[PDB]
Design a protein around this ligand. Structure first.
Ligand SMILES: [Zn+2]
Lengths: 315, 416
């Protein structure tokens, strides 16, 4: 109704409809600390919110008051909670509220409180029909929005909406193959559908990742996904992966490629390979190359790695 | 010279492989702007220039601890956080807290405490685990008996129980949701006040361990992208619960270290995202934790003088690009001057300056020696002296418990 910036906005203390209630001012003590100097409008709305909350008043007026309170501080979890308690008590039209939260989220897409509330309305309504479209829109504003991704994962798991996510992931990866949030979603879909143990799927993924790495050799996301799906399986167990990797070394090298090879050799040594010495030396070398030149920011880590390799594969 | 100024450092710039996407484009921009800042320090020098503007930081903090502009209206449900952010920054800067504000902080925090346990974002607000963590940390930073005595321990335990879920997780608040951070707030607060019952954290360690994903890092809830803020909370929570081994520490270590930006020198929160001052703590804070973890497992290849990240490069990023002329610290040049970043850039700077493992101690203070900050506990992010002080005090007290839960089972009115 009456927007807080309207030229005709009226303070709650001057509304006839609220004349019966005594506002409750905040008590910060005789000598406050971290005291916020609230505007007159903010302190007025919250003085009435405290009065409404204190008497647990479940009215239509208290419901509308919470919209202003949220406008003033959409991070106030007590206000958001009370509004839900009011949505129930007043048997409010939830689709109407969905329209409200849609608009608000578009404004403050990074506010957690806002997504939590949408999640509640979705379980209550048990309707996830609008969800994937809406989130896609939000993700257009920022494809890495943590909260939007979390909500998307919740809707998909709860309502088992796995059918088209891998395609969506393929769309966004084309839009930005460096979007680590999308590489993660890819893993989320696959490990929750076909799983990675299906050697055909695993084969599809490694090949897909290798082509991805070929196009943008310095995109860390792809490198991370590749190692992600094979790390637990034993990197050295894939002889053809190692040969394709070494084949990248010329026109497609990077500290990632070098790092990966160190993993492979690290695994080879764990797996009691033959030519232990030849391998340890190939590892230690790449380690120093990384510490001293190709990945000096991580010199401390690489010195640790090399040191660990020696500590357990020498003499 | 300075790591960031060296000639070869220009080699650390982004190679977009000629494939431009929003990510590379935004990354290049920050690198260009940061380079401009680097150039300035390369260019001019006759007197030492890497200096922590202590003076200006203190003014900002001393003022904020008392009065905030309506720019902070958005943190009206986060007042105990403001108290922690500020008091911790002051503590790190070695500024003592006067008895009068100490008492006023205590009293304010008392007002923030729910009568049914925990602390809310402000007076009369429902309790919530984030402000509960902050409030306890703040009271522990003050560290007086008056401060300790504010916490209703029995009610706090009751409150943690009210949020504890069967699968091991904890709700942020009643009617709220769960995440690794709430698990961390409960473990932090429960251990400091000595209220850990045999079943309080049942299943928690396994719930946190499921948050570690394919990257090696930890998301907020299982399935989510690895994020520095959550990864810190995850590992810190497990250290408190002595269950760090529930995680694959190797993929965790490899993930964090990769989080340090090669050019900028500071840490990003997630892979392929921008650098940011606050992660100087969230991310770098993991290294001392991983160092303890691996060391307890007898790892022989551990350094006896350095954390596994470029301590120097992080300090350079912080000192050169994360300070505001008007006081307070930042996300990055001309970006986000607030009490949160002031607390975390400082907390990260202090982690980067001090190393300690057993008897081994070794500092690395870039810039003027005057830059040394007091050390911070890597689990709780309050002074180690304050951690020891709080725990020793709360261990004088017996863990609370519900007697009705221990007496004999009943079933017949007749036997009354
Ligand atoms: Zn930040």
């Amino acid at each position: 109704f009456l927007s807080l910036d309207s030229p005709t906005y009226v303070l709650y203390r001057d509304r006839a409809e609220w004349a019966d209630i005594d506002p409750v001012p905040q008590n910060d003590g005789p000598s406050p600390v971290v005291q916020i100097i609230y505007s007159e409008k903010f302190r007025d709305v919250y003085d009435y919110f405290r009065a409404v909350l204190q008497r647990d008043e479940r009215s239509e007026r208290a419901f509308k008051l919470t919209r202003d309170a949220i406008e003033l501080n959409a991070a106030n979890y007590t206000v958001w909670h009370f509004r839900r308690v009011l949505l129930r008590s007043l048997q409010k039209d939830l689709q109407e509220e969905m329209n409200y939260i849609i608009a608000i989220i578009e404004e403050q897409p990074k506010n957690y409180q806002v997504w939590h509330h949408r999640r509640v309305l979705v379980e209550w309504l048990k309707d996830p029909s609008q969800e994937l479209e809406f989130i896609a829109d939000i993700l257009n504003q920022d494809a890495k929005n943590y909260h939007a991704w979390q909500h998307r994962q919740w809707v998909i798991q709860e309502f088992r909406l796995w059918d088209n996510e891998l395609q969506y992931v393929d769309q966004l990866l084309k839009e930005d193959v460096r979007n680590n949030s999308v590489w993660n979603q890819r893993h989320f879909v696959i490990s929750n559908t076909t799983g990675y143990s299906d050697r055909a799927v695993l084969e599809r993924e490694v090949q897909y990742t290798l082509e991805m790495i070929k196009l943008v050799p310095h995109n860390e996301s792809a490198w991370n996904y590749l190692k992600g799906i094979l790390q637990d399986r034993g990197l050295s167990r894939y002889p053809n992966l190692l040969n394709q990797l070494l084949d990248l070394q010329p026109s497609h090298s990077s500290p990632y490629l070098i790092a990966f090879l160190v993993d492979i050799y690290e695994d080879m040594l764990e797996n009691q390979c033959d030519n232990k010495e030849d391998i340890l030396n190939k590892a230690l070398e790449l380690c120093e190359i990384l510490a001293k030149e190709k990945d000096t920011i991580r010199k401390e880590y690489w010195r640790y790695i090399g040191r660990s390799l020696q500590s357990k594969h020498s003499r | 010279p300075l790591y960031s100024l060296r000639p070869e450092h220009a080699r650390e710039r982004l190679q977009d492989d000629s494939v431009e996407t929003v990510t590379s484009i935004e990354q290049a921009k920050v690198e260009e702007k940061i380079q401009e800042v680097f150039s300035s320090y390369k260019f001019n020098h006759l007197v030492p220039r890497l200096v922590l503007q202590r003076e200006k930081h203190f003014h900002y903090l001393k003022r904020g601890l008392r009065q905030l502009t309506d720019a902070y209206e958005c943190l009206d449900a986060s007042r105990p956080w403001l108290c922690y952010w500020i008091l911790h920054s002051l503590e790190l800067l070695d500024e003592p807290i006067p008895q009068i504000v100490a008492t006023d902080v205590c009293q304010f925090l008392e007002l923030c405490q729910s009568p049914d346990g925990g602390f809310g974002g402000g007076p009369g607000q429902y309790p919530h685990l984030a402000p509960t963590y902050a409030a306890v940390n703040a009271l522990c930073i003050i560290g007086t008996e008056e401060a300790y005595n504010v916490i209703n321990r029995e009610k706090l335990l009751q409150y943690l129980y009210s949020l504890k879920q069967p699968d091991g997780s904890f709700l942020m608040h009643v009617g709220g949701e769960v995440d690794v951070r709430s698990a961390y707030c409960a473990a932090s607060v429960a251990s400091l006040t000595n209220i850990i019952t045999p079943d309080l954290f049942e299943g928690t360690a396994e719930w946190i361990a499921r948050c570690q994903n394919w990257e090696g890092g930890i998301g907020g809830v299982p399935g989510m992208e690895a994020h520095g803020g959550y990864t810190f909370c995850g590992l810190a929570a497990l250290v408190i619960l002595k269950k760090e081994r529930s995680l694959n520490l190797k993929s965790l270590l490899q993930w964090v270290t990769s989080r340090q930006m090669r050019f900028e020198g500071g840490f990003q929160g997630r892979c392929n995202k921008l650098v940011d001052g606050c992660y100087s703590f969230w991310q770098a804070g993991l290294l001392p934790l991983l160092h303890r973890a691996l060391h307890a497992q007898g790892d022989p290849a551990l350094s006896m003088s350095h954390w596994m990240f470029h301590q120097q490069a992080l300090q350079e990023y912080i000192l050169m690009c994360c300070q505001c002329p008007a006081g307070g610290l930042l996300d990055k040049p001309g970006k986000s001057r607030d009490f949160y970043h002031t607390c975390y850039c400082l907390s990260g700077l202090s982690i980067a300056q001090h190393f300690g493992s057993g008897a081994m101690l070794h500092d690395v203070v870039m810039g003027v020696p005057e830059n040394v900050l007091q050390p911070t506990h890597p689990v709780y992010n309050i002074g180690p002296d304050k951690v020891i002080q709080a725990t020793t005090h709360f261990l004088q007290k017996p863990v609370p418990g519900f007697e009705e839960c221990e007496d004999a089972v009943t079933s017949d009115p007749a036997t009354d």
